[PDB]
Symmetry: none
Subunit: 260 residues, 4 copies
C-alpha cells in the first residue's frame, strides 16, 4: 500500500530541484525533508509518494468554523497518511494529531536588513517606528495570539491592529518584503529559516537578538494511526546515529553562498 | 489513589533543604524537578509523593542478566508510577517505557579544570589545552570519562563515528577505570586531577557548575549531540497523555524557561 | 446601584482609544486612571461607569459667587460618587470632600523649550536660561503661567513666600494673560513660544511629556513643593474607607509602582 | 484637658536635650517631631505633654497573641491621645487607628559602609556573601514578610533563616553594626534616617541604589477620636504654608557635618 506523504514547498526542506520539468515521481523534489522521508521509508519499509499540500498553509483554525487547514487539515480529514515537513509541535495540534519526537530544535527570532538599534524584542516592541509581522496561518502568529506575557501581548495588539496588512502569505514573501522595505520592516520567523536565509545570496539580511522561546519540528500522523510508534522509533534511531545532524550540516552550512 | 514520583538526587533538579531534618513529605526537597512536579500535578490534579531510588542510578539495562536497573529499571517493574527527573530520551529506553515531549534541551559537552589566565599589551587571555572532541581523542596526556549507568555511556558505546569510536575504544580499556558513579564524583575528580582529567557530562549540569562557586571549571567546545530530558511513564499507563499535554502547556505558557532562568542563571555565584 | 466615576481628560491617566468610535462603555478609555479604577472595583465589588466632566476643569471656587466648579464642583452637589482622577489634595478641597491617601507623588515643576546642542575638546553641554524658580522670578525675558482653575494656580495665589509672592504678582497682571485652559494648550504654547515662555505644571505630566516624542521640552530645577494625588469622595459617603483601604492594598502589593512603570517608562522615547 | 502625646527617641525626630538633666517638661526634648507637635498644638489649640513610649518599638502584632505593642499599642489601649512620630502609614495599622495625610515621603533604601558592587537590591539578594537585616517590630520587616515579589520573598526567607540573628533591636544598633561589621553587613531602613546618618559624623556610611517602594509618615490617632480631622487639617495647612519643608531643611541639611 502506497503511503501518501504531505509536505510544503519550503527551503531548504523541500525544493523542486533545478530541471524538475523533465523528472517525474519523487525524483523531482529535493531538500532536507525529502532525505528525511527517504530515511524514514527505508527504516519502516514502505513505499511513499511525496505530495505538496494544495495551499501553502501549515495548519490552523479558521474564524469560528472549527475546520483545520493546510497540512494539519490534510492529515485530520484522511487525505494524507504522514506529514514530514517543518511542522512545529504545539498545544492545539497535539490534541488532534500525534507528533513524534522533535527532529530539529528551533526558536522564534527576529530578522532585519543588514550594533542593531533594536536587538532584543523588548526594544523592538517599545520602538513603534519599524513595523514587524509574522506568517499567517502558522505557529508564530498563534504563539503571539495566545501569549499572556506583557511584551508579547503588546506585540500581538500591535500586529493585529496594523494598517496596512502586516502579515505575509508566505515566508518567502516576508523575506522579499524585508529586503524591499529598506529596513523599516522586521520579520518574526523560525530560527532555522532565518539562518538559511541569512547565509544565502545576496546575504543582505541578518538575525538580531536571541530566541523568544524554544520549540521543535515533529513528524505528524493522523490520530490513532499505526505509523506513530514506528516513525517515532525511526526518528530516535536517526538522531542517535547522527543522521539528522549530518543532514542539517549538508543542507544548511555545506554550500554557504555568502561571506561570513 | 496516590501515585509515587521517583527521582534522582541531582542538583539543581532536586536538592536537600538546609534544615530538611525536621521537614517531611515533599517539603524536604527543592529544585527544578520538585516544582516541575508541583505544576504537573496542578495541571492534572493528583496527589504525588516524592521518592529517591535506592541504587541512585539513572538507569541502564545490564548485560547477560537482561534486567533493567535504575529509575527505568524500577519503573518497568511497577515500583514507580512516573519519573519526573532528568532522564534522557534514548532509543533503547523508549522501547520499554514512554517519554513525554522534551521539557529542556541538553547536549554532551566537555568539562575541564579552568586554566589560569596567561600573563601576556597587558591584555589577559584564556587558553585551554582542549578545544574540541577530536583533539581530546587524539591526545593521551589528558584522560576523560563518563558517568556509570547513564545515557552518555550508552551513546559512546554504540556510536559508529570515528572520533567517538576512538573515544570509546580508549574509555573501555583504561587503568584505573575512567568511569564515575556520581556526577559530583566526576566533578571532584576534575577539580582534584589538576587539569589532567576531563568529564563528559550533560551541558545543563556543566553550565550550572560553571555558574556556581568555586568555579574552577570551564566548558570547552560545543555540544557533541542534541538530546532532551523527558518525563518517563510505563507502557499502558493513563498518565502519559495528560503528562505530555501538561508539558506542552508549560512550554507554551512561558513557564519552563522561567523556571530554568530562576534555577540556573539567577543564583550565579561566579 | 451602580455609581459613576468622573475623570479629567489628560494623558497618560485617561486617553482616548485609537479606534474608539466603535467601542462603548469603559472600553473607550485607556491609561493609568482606568487601570486604577479597575483595580479599585476589583478590591471591592461595585459596577462603575466612566464619565468625563462637561466643563473639563479640575475644580475651584469662582470669584464673588462661592460656587464650586470642575470635578469637585460636580462631586459636592451630588452629581457624582467618586473621582479617580489626578486631583491634587489641597486644604480648600478637603473641607468640602474626602480624600484618600495619595496614590502617586507630584510636585510643581518648570517646563521650558529644550535648548540646542552647545558646539563648544569636542563635547556637547546643556545650558538653559532658567535653572530655578528664583532666577525665573527675577528674569522677565521669559514669561510663565499656570493652568487655569487648577491647584498650582491656587498654590501661587495663596503663598506668603517672597519668591512665590513675586511669581503671583507678575502672573496676575500680565499682558496678555499667561494662564491656559488646558495642560495640552499650555504645552503647545511652550512649544510654539520659541523658548520665551515657561509652563508651571505637575512633575508627573512634565516627565511624561518630556519622555514622549517629539520631546522638544525639558524640566529644570526641582519641585517647588511636595503634593499627592487623592481619590476624591463626597462628604459622608460610604466609600471613603473601602477606597482608602484599596489604595493602601495596591501600594503594599506594588501595583501602583508597576502601573507607573508601564504607563510612564514603557512607552517613552528619545 | 492635657493631651498625652506618645513618641519615640529617634534622630532627628526626637532628641534628648544636651542639658536635659537640668530641664523639665516638654523643654527637655528637641527635634523635628517636637517642633511638629508644637505647631500642631498651636493650630489645634490644646495643652500637650510629650511622653516617650516605654519600649523603643514602633508597633506590630506579636506571635498569635493578637496584642499591639509600641506606639500603636500605646494608642489602641487608651493610654495615648495622639502619636506624632516617624510612624509609617501601612495596611495593618490603618485598620486599627486613623492616619492623617503624610507629612514626609520615604522609601526602603540600603545603607552600607563607605566600585559599589552591591548597586540595587537585586544584586544584593543574588549575592549571599554580605549579610543584610532590618529593624524588628517595624515596617520594613512587615513589608518583606508580606511581600509577594520573588526578590523580596527571597530576601525575607534569607533574613528569617539566618544565623546568628540579623535583626537589630534599634536603628542606632543597626548603624553601629554597619559601622563595626567592616562593611560585611547591609542595613535596610527608611531613606530619611539613611540620609541623616550618612550626612553626620563620622560620615563613614553611604546609601546605594534607589528606593524599593514609596511610603510616608503620618500622625496617628486612636480610632474614633475627635482629634483626627483637626490634625489632618493642620497637617494640610502646614504643608501648604511650607512649614514641613522648612522643618526638614532645618533638621536634615542646615548643619551638614560632612564634606559633600
Ligand atoms: N542539531 S539539530 O537541531 O539538527 C537536532 C535537534 C534534535 C535532535 C537531533 C538533532 Cl540533529 N533530537 C532530539 C530528539 C531525540 C531524542 C532526544 C530528544 C528528542 C528525542 N530532539 S532535538 O533536541 O530537537
Ligand atoms: N530553553 S529550555 O532548554 O529551558 C526549553 C527547551 C524545550 C522546550 C522549552 C524550553 Cl523553556 N519545549 C520543547 C517541546 C515543546 C514542543 C516542541 C518541542 C517540545 C514539544 N522541547 S525543548 O526544545 O527541549
Ligand atoms: N513611586 S509612585 O510615585 O508611583 C508611589 C507614590 C506613593 C505611593 C505608592 C507609589 Cl508606587 N503610596 C503612598 C501611600 C501609602 C501609604 C503611605 C503614604 C501613602 C499612604 N503615597 S505616595 O508616597 O504618593
Ligand atoms: N519634602 S518632604 O518629604 O518634607 C514632604 C512630603 C510631603 C508633604 C510635605 C513635605 Cl515638606 N505633604 C504631602 C500631603 C500634603 C497634601 C498633599 C499630599 C499629602 C496631603 N505628603 S508628602 O508628599 O509625603
Ligand atoms: N514552521 C511553522 C510555520 C512558520 C511560521 O509560522 O513562521 C509551523 O509549522 O507552524
Ligand atoms: N541525564 C542522563 C545521566 C547523566 C549522564 O549520563 O551524564 C540520563 O538520564 O541517563
Ligand atoms: N492636578 C491639578 C491640575 C493640574 C495643574 O493645576 O497644573 C489639580 O488636580 O487641580
Ligand atoms: N519607621 C518605621 C520603622 C523603621 C524600620 O522598620 O526600618 C515605622 O514606623 O514603622
Amino acid at each position: 500500500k502506497t503511503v501518501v506523504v504531505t509536505t510544503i514547498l519550503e527551503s531548504p526542506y523541500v525544493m523542486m530541484k533545478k530541471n524538475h520539468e523533465m523528472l517525474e515521481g519523487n525524483e523531482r523534489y529535493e531538500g532536507y525533508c525529502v532525505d528525511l522521508a527517504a530515511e524514514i521509508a527505508k527504516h519502516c519499509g514502505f513505499k511513499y509518494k511525496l505530495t505538496i499540500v494544495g495551499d501553502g498553509k501549515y495548519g490552523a483554525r479558521d474564524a469560528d468554523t472549527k475546520i483545520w487547514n493546510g497540512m494539519v487539515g490534510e492529515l485530520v480529514y484522511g487525505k494524507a497518511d504522514i506529514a514530514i515537513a517543518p511542522l512545529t509541535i504545539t498545544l492545539v495540534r497535539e490534541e488532534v494529531i500525534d507528533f513524534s519526537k522533535p527532529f530539529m530544535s528551533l526558536g522564534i527570532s527576529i530578522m532585519i536588513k543588514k550594533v542593531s538599534p533594536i536587538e532584543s524584542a523588548e526594544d523592538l516592541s517599545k520602538q513603534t517606528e519599524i513595523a514587524y509581522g509574522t506568517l499567517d496561518s502558522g505557529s508564530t502568529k498563534e504563539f503571539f495570539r495566545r501569549s499572556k506575557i506583557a511584551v508579547f501581548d503588546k506585540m500581538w495588539t500591535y500586529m493585529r491592529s496594523a494598517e496596512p496588512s502586516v502579515f505575509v502569505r508566505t515566508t518567502a514573501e516576508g523575506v522579499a518584503r524585508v529586503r524591499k522595505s529598506k529596513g523599516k520592516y522586521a520579520y518574526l520567523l523560525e530560527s532555522t529559516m532565518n539562518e538559511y536565509i541569512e547565509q544565502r545570496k545576496p546575504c543582505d539580511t541578518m538575525k538580531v537578538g536571541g530566541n523568544l522561546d524554544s520549540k521543535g519540528y515533529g513528524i505528524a500522523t493522523p490520530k490513532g494511526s499505526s505509523l506513530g510508534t514506528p516513525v517515532n522509533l525511526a526518528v530516535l534511531k536517526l538522531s542517535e546515529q547522527g543522521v539528522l545532524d549530518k543532514l542539517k550540516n549538508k543542507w544548511w552550512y555545506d554550500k554557504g553562498e555568502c561571506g561570513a
